[PDB]
């Protein structure tokens, strides 16, 4: 049996598998950072998104 597609990948910085990486890339988060910290919002540039 082949479990390399679901076992964690040590090459990635976060220990997620190939399928977990596909599931994280397919779901488009609005903003998953939660690290705005009011310093990003001081500059009013159009790249700031909502």
């Amino acid at each position: 049996f082949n479990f390399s597609q679901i076992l964690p990948d040590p090459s990635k910085p976060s220990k997620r598998s190939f399928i977990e990486d596909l599931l994280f890339n397919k779901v488009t988060l609005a903003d998953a950072g939660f690290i705005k910290q009011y310093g990003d919002c001081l500059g009013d540039i159009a790249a700031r998104d909502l």
Binding site: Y38, C41, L42, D44, I45, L50
Partner: protein, 49 residues
């Protein structure tokens, strides 16, 4: 109030946000555009035993 790069058209005076609050202004004496950003605020939590 900060210096801004908003390309105001010459008939435009104010800029508005999504909630129709003023986001940029034109200074009347010197025709320049100023961004308005509200002052620093946040929540305070107390961690105690």
């Amino acid at each position: 109030l900060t210096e801004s790069n908003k390309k105001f058209l010459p008939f435009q005076q104010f800029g508005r946000d999504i909630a129709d609050t003023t986001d940029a202004v034109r200074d009347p004496q010197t025709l320049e555009i100023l961004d308005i950003t509200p002052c620093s605020f946040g929540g305070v939590s107390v961690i105690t035993p």
